[PDB]
């Protein structure tokens, strides 16, 4: 993302929303709702909080913390290689090598008995009120906007309250906007494609950044002279 | 020190380095130096 | 003679992207990112302008100029060759 | 940019747009959002103001000016070195390089723990009421023009107060001056074409411009003759 | 061009929109807004007036003169060596090679501390009064009768007060004058068509017309015989 | 062109136009703009008058003059050497060879100090009145009668006077006239394709016919018998 | 016999930009920047104008010329030889 | 009606063209080393 997240509360979509008279009765209890399935549909990942948490592993299970959403990685706390999801069927099953895990809920299945693990998971940005906090880009602000608009008015074309072609004008605006939303939040930076630079071009490829924590994934690969 | 495999990257162009890596220094192909040494090598012949 | 020239239009460099920088890591990764879904493109991809602007490829100021040398080239061999005919010295004969 | 980026009034954009007896009710407050949101939506860079700014690291984070925007670059004060994205996942956590940074909110996450650098972003010229300046060039006033009117023909619309044909060519004209000022303000200069004359036609490649703040990046690239 | 931009006041545009009943209520003030709107669309070079002007640099800054649109070129005072557009991101910001320029506002920022430098650039040829003066060439005052036109026909048919058909008449008559009009001012001139000639035809070309200011672009190729 | 360019006076159109009872209502006024619209927008070379004039540059600008409409050449007037356009951006301004010119109004930027220069440019052939003189060519004479017609049905129809059909009829013969009038005077006669023919076949190919008026461009290249 | 002539349409010239300078930096870098959203393509982008405007590619004034030199070398070729033979004397008995 | 039509996809990838490129690219390196060194192919056998 070539433009920084600075972070406004929710009702600055109202803000914007309420001007058109055929959406005066929307609440903060409807944008809530409508701005977690936007942020869930678009899964743009700049507007989900790092976090890192390290927890201990009882035997090949341990607690998850409450506000994850998704997993970055998994690795051992004291060695650091990193961990990959488990293919195997039977993991703590016994009968009569490279470490793995799986997430399901708020239990995660690690291949190690008695271990702590470190990881780098994803969450929302919070407000002082337990509410979602939305990024202020107005490309994101007109898509979520939009997004409100375009449910509100297919309910009330279900209805019959609302013209076809007011309902199809919506629908155009709201996709075109989700494109241009979806290409805003995902095109790297200058700063990120030098990273991408650094790794695209590589005399000799570089292909276990993954036991790091990609932290090697943008280095340059610098050759000696000879 | 062309023929010895060593390139000055000041005889070659203006430089905007001291550092010996090809992301901003240039290989050298020792490739002049057999046209040299076929000639060397009959001068002993002779 | 010059070589093939190419029109090129910027109307797909992505946002806060200068043509330099962009062109620059365009030659270093031979990849270079677009964004299809600029606000300039609204049109072609409403419907509202013609789709001609969003695809029909680049356009080359190209000039046949190669051939033109080619007949210079054997035209000059020719009267060389027609030359050392009339003089009774020949190719095969000066070497 | 072919021309130079003079400043000019907000107000400005309503003596255009109340000319139309049908956007008569628009306000200054209108002006603003909207304003807003065609400079992001067309996210020029020359409409922004390039401004450097020095912070100083605490321990793997820094505070963040507060109308920063999108950064250009980061790079240290001491060395000069430019610092690329972050590709880890385990930055400042610890267990049992190539400096990087990484901007969310209002803070910025470095991989050095003490240490000052420069950050060269990108701002909005401000007026002395402490609000958006826009460009005069009349390219991008009357595509604004047309993008205030093709939000309130489309809210009209909406309730039926605009016929389907007066909105759709209100779209038509803004789309092709939305393409028109992206051409106008993103095509380069001749200046601008020498730094890129000067950046293609090179007989030994610079791939190195990002260590430097891209400063040669337009620099003649000479051959000694022998 | 192949003719001369002989200068005009701009009511002579209202001499010739008058004549239509539907356009009886423009005035100079109208005539004055569409008819820089249109100059900049257009965005013909030879329109504007070429200036030269001298200022002198404090430290990587300049002031920039009032009329200024556009600039031709920069150099150096002193050795006339031409300045580049500015790829750098920290310029005059210090930490603890060939010269370029960068120009937003009324402020021109160099990358040379104490110096004077030459500007050539583009304003607007001026009346007695403080107003714009336009070519009288038939052609461009067609397109611009038509650009007014057009305009205020968008305005009556969003009012409901032009029949469609109208509107698409003018909308058409006006793309094909604006091309023409297009064409009438970039086709070169035979003496242009000369230093064209003179700058493609080159056994051992020239890359260096920059460095100058453009001055041997159009200088003849001279092969001495051997 | 094949034909002759013999002169009559405007009011000939006149004459033609007022035989359709709905152009009774122009005037010589609408007559004399609408011609010399006409004449602009065809550009036929062969309608403007020819004619030679000598002035003196004062220092690099000299007095233009008052007919002059287009420039086919500038020259020397001691040495006959024909001047190029000016590619320079920093003409007359010092700092601390080829001869060029560049003409903006009424006045002619050379690259000399103190020289007198002759200047060949294109007018328009007065009436003793002093009033545009058209030719009596009758396609010439059907164009602009059609011209006339056409701009004066867009006015009607605009009110919505006449008939969509009539003024696309009207279009359509103007459209078919236009393309025959430029056909017919820009097509070379037998001796300009003899002067044609002459430039066409050159065994030893001649590239500086600009240094002389095009004088030699038509002279035949004779080769001498061995 | 000269070169092939491509005819070449300015429409799409950046603004601000003199063919001339355009035309070099089309030359040095092999790219031209193009402007498809210039005004005088507000026609054909906007429906109003015919689409071939932002299409059709630029045509070429080109006429067939080698191959009638190519006929004429090869005629002069026959005439020598039937000329050598009617002499009795061959190309070999030249050299 | 694509579902009664449109035949069998395949997940091709042109892999083989990779492979040849960098065996194209041995043969140079070597042929160059070999030139470098003065000593020819034919020279070592």
């Known amino acids: 993302m070539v433009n920084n997240i600075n972070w406004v509360k929710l009702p600055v979509i109202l803000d914007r929303l309420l001007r058109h008279p055929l959406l005066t009765d929307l609440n903060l209890e409807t944008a809530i709702q409508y701005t977690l399935d936007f942020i869930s549909a678009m899964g743009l990942p700049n507007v989900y909080v790092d976090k890192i948490e390290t927890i201990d592993i009882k035997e090949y299970r341990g607690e998850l913390p409450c506000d994850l959403i998704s997993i970055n990685q998994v690795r051992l706390h004291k060695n650091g290689i990193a961990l990959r999801a488990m293919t195997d069927n039977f993991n703590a099953y016994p009968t009569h090598g490279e470490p793995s895990f799986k997430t399901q809920g708020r239990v995660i299945f690690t291949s190690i008995k008695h271990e702590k693990v470190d990881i780098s998971y994803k969450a929302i940005m919070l407000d002082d009120e337990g509410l979602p906090l939305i990024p202020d880009n107005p490309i994101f602000l007109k898509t979520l906007e939009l997004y409100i608009k375009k449910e509100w008015f297919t309910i009330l074309f279900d209805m019959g309250k609302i013209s076809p072609a007011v309902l199809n004008n919506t629908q155009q605006e709201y996709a075109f906007k989700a494109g241009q939303c979806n290409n805003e939040f995902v095109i790297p930076s200058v700063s990120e494609m030098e990273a991408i630079t650094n790794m695209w071009n590589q005399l000799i490829p570089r292909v276990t950044e993954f036991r790091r924590g990609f932290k090697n994934l943008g280095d340059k690969e610098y050759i000696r002279v000879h | 020190d062309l023929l010895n495999g060593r390139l000055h990257m000041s005889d070659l162009e203006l430089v905007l380095i001291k550092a010996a890596y090809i992301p901003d220094r240039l290989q050298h192909y020792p490739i002049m130096n057999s046209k040299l040494n076929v000639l060397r090598g009959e001068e002993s012949k002779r | ?95």
């Open chain 3, 1 to 95: 003679n010059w070589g093939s020239i190419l029109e090129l239009d910027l109307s797909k460099v992505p946002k806060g992207w200068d043509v330099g920088k962009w062109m620059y890591y365009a030659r270093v990764n031979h990849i270079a990112v677009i964004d299809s879904f600029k606000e300039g493109t609204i049109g072609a991809s409403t419907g509202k302008l013609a789709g001609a602007l969003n695809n029909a490829g680049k356009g080359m100021i190209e000039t046949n100029i190669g051939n033109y040398i080619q007949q210079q080239i054997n035209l000059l061999e020719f009267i060389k060759m027609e030359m050392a005919d009339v003089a009774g010295i020949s190719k095969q004969r000066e070497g």
